[PDB]
Amino acid sequence: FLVSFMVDARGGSMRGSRHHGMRIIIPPRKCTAPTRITCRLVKRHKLANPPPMVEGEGLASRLVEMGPAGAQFLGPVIVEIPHFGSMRGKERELIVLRSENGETWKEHQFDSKNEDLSELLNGMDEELDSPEELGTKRICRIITKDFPQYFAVVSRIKQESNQILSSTTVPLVQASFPEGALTKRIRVGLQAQPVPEETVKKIKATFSPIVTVEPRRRKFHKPITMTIPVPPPSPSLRLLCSITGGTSPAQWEDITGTTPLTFIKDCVSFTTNVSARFWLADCHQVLETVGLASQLYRELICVPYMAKFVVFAKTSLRCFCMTDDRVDKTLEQQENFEEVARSKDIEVLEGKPIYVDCYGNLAPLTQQLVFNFYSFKENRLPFSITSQEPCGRLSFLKEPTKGLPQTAVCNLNITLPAHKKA
Amino acid sequence: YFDVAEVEAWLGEQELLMMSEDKGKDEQSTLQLLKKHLQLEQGVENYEESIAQLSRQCRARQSQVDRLYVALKELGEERRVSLEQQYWLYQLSRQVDELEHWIAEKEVVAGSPELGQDFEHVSVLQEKFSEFASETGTAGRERLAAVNQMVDELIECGHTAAATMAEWKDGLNEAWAELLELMGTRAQLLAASRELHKFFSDARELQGQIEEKRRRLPRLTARPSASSMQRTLRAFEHDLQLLVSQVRQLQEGAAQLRTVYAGEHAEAIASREQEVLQGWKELLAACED
Lengths: 422, 289
Prior knowledge:
The complex is a heterodimer. Helices cover 8% and strands 39% of the residues of chain A. By secondary structure, chain A is mostly beta strands. Chain A has three domains: 1-157, Chondroitinase Ac, Chain A, domain 3 (Sandwich), CATH 2.60.220; 159-301, Chondroitinase Ac, Chain A, domain 3 (Sandwich); 304-415, Immunoglobulin-like, CATH 2.60.40.2660. In chain A, the strands form six sheets. In chain A, strands 1, 4, 5, 6, 8, 9 and 11 form a seven-stranded antiparallel sheet that branches. The relative contact order of chain A is 0.10. By secondary structure, chain B is an all-alpha fold. Chain B is rod-shaped and about 140 Å long. It is classed as structural protein.
């Protein structure tokens, strides 16, 4: 199917012709009646009041209008939707939103998960390998017993949540609420975004994980403990915080003076009374630690995507970075072009422009060249092209410099078809 | 030097007229402006039979002006193409928009959910749709192919905005095959609403045939005669033995039916067929005694 199909209480195992990965499964005796099931990945621009995102959270897939606005299934059913969010091995997770009428946005979840029982002797059970297999195939399994009008898939950080709380990413990040500091025993989540040194090179002066507590800007009645592991080395140490909540971006400031900084081997324990963003920075210049943080912060909040890199040629080049587009590009196959190199899946930065260098048969015509990658947009990069050498390889890099080697993103080998010259 | 004063002046005003900042406003503008461009081009080409006087005068500054005719007819052979483009754009756009609104208008009819209130007329709707299946199917195939090849022509020409025409081509062909699919769904929905009703009305005719039988037995024991007594009874037996042949198709329908539906629906099919088999018992017991 492309968008829709009918199905009876005999149950249906239908994959989506258009967007590879897409797969609705309705086990037997679970549909109310024969019904029109639908699953269309509507463009983000087209819709209004799209599900709200915060600073550091990221849209994995497009949004998925479903076939029956209110169908209530007897069993459960599965919608496998494919995504392109970079997972980074549990450094980030996928939280699944749902709107009943595309005005109100809520989280969606099912308490009970089983394999052999939901299928009910379905002949092609075909559970997609292990859950880890889904995490590798960039599939998100949604399991519901009623179709909400719109799902979102989203890549947050891990936000281990309870109602004592230490992080599943980094364990020296134990932040536990004390006895009687919350009026209603409410769920609270702890997020723990580390920082690669490799990217600290970008802009010298060190940093620790960015720790956050998910119910934000809510005062805690009794002081709440925190533990954060320290940066390595280059008063020396400044602690930062932002209290801003939800949709708006945060702002940083140094609060070394207003917080007592208790030391334990490898980390720091301290109290606050507000749920907010905490981040450490050992360096011996203090006026810069605000802005040298908010330069780095800008880099960290960008969303990662496992994008394909494809290069199209026709004697003469057009270079593309993309995800979720139909492979058989009509424009190029008609202008008589040839896909010269479609690469593996690669983490790229939804915002950060990406460069291209040429190590090949011929040089580019006639300044350096770049194109900004965005998620779910086609990304145009058009070109102008000893005679002994037949072929050449070009590569894409995130750093432009020639002083130190800043290794590249993708190495691809190309070959002009050469039906004529120019 | 009457030459470089008069002819250089003529091409001086020729350049200004042909060069323009008006590319064409609407569809029927570009056209009635391009007509004017072909007049100007033929007038430049009919200035080739006056440059034999200039060639004669000079032959018996010349390299400065020898180029200006090939340049004003290359500006002609360029801005003719620009005006051609600006027409063809307005055409292709109009075809697209109007076709989207055709896919639009027909989409509504497909997406309608009316599956009737009784057999007879949902069985009508079956036809009243399946016609629209062909009309739309084939007529679409047509409009599609025509517009498709409108694009592929404009591509092979090398129009300025072809890219847009590509994603217009996808933007149409996709929504089309979507339409095709949608009709193929609707169709099936109707087929089921049919069989379901066929069941229902078959009940309404069997519960009635039987609720007649059981009522008409007291009449067949009581006015009377012996010579049309056994004959009438044997004839009723001939009936009932065909009523069984019918109800075998009734039970045998209900079975395949339950498997398609579930829940409130299947729980209602149950009560319908249980109700009619109960009428079977309440006749069956009577016809013994």
